[PDB]
Enzyme design. Structure first.
Site, mmCIF file in Angstrom:
data_model
loop_
_atom_site.group_PDB
_atom_site.id
_atom_site.type_symbol
_atom_site.label_atom_id
_atom_site.label_comp_id
_atom_site.label_asym_id
_atom_site.label_seq_id
_atom_site.Cartn_x
_atom_site.Cartn_y
_atom_site.Cartn_z
ATOM 1 N N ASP A 34 0.873 -1.153 0.000
ATOM 2 C CA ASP A 34 0.000 0.000 0.000
ATOM 3 C C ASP A 34 0.928 1.225 0.000
ATOM 4 O O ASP A 34 1.039 1.899 1.016
ATOM 5 C CB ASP A 34 -0.944 -0.033 1.236
ATOM 6 C CG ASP A 34 -1.994 1.094 1.276
ATOM 7 O OD1 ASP A 34 -2.288 1.683 0.236
ATOM 8 O OD2 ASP A 34 -2.509 1.365 2.359
ATOM 9 N N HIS A 57 3.700 2.625 0.797
ATOM 10 C CA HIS A 57 4.868 2.403 1.624
ATOM 11 C C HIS A 57 4.316 2.220 3.028
ATOM 12 O O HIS A 57 4.421 1.146 3.606
ATOM 13 C CB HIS A 57 5.847 3.589 1.501
ATOM 14 C CG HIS A 57 7.018 3.412 2.441
ATOM 15 N ND1 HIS A 57 7.302 4.256 3.455
ATOM 16 C CD2 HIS A 57 7.975 2.384 2.436
ATOM 17 C CE1 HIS A 57 8.399 3.758 4.050
ATOM 18 N NE2 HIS A 57 8.828 2.628 3.457
#
Length: 137
Positions: free
Chosen positions: A14, A16
């Site tokens: 997602d 980071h």
């Protein structure tokens, strides 16, 4: 309960870390300490550092991206009755559910000392991170 210690991390695929999302800002809003690990699910490793820092609460940035490790990790830490960490405001933790959890947190409902932030929360809810956990439950 008012122990200055918040171990945060995890998240899967997602970007980071859209959970990192200054939940650590809530640290400041709790007068607590930072124990950001990263994006790992250091169970028995950060449990060794949970004696060290004395993890008050755990904040996961994943809706099952830690496995049954983190699940019966902190439940085992309760059932440890040595390692303090009976406050787990587990961000995400199981999608399409809020209060009414499956058979999974049916048994962990009885425990249910861990709350979860439903998918589609805000960092406004993190002001409520340490407002409820430090306040009363």
């Amino acid at each position: 309960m008012e122990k200055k210690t918040i171990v945060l991390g995890v998240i899967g695929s997602d970007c980071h870390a859209v959970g990192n999302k200054i939940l650590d800002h809530s640290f400041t809003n709790a007068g607590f300490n930072v124990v950001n690990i990263g994006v790992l699910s250091s169970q028995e490793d950060f449990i060794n550092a949970a004696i060290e820092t004395k993890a008050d609460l755990i904040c996961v940035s994943s809706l099952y991206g830690q496995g049954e490790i983190d699940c019966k990790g902190l439940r085992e830490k309760c059932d440890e009755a040595g390692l303090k960490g009976i406050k787990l405001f587990v961000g995400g933790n199981i999608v399409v559910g809020k209060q009414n959890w499956p058979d999974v947190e049916q048994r962990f409902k009885a425990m249910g000392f861990d709350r979860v932030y439903p998918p589609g929360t805000s960092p406004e809810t993190t002001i409520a991170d340490m407002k409820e956990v430090l306040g009363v439950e």
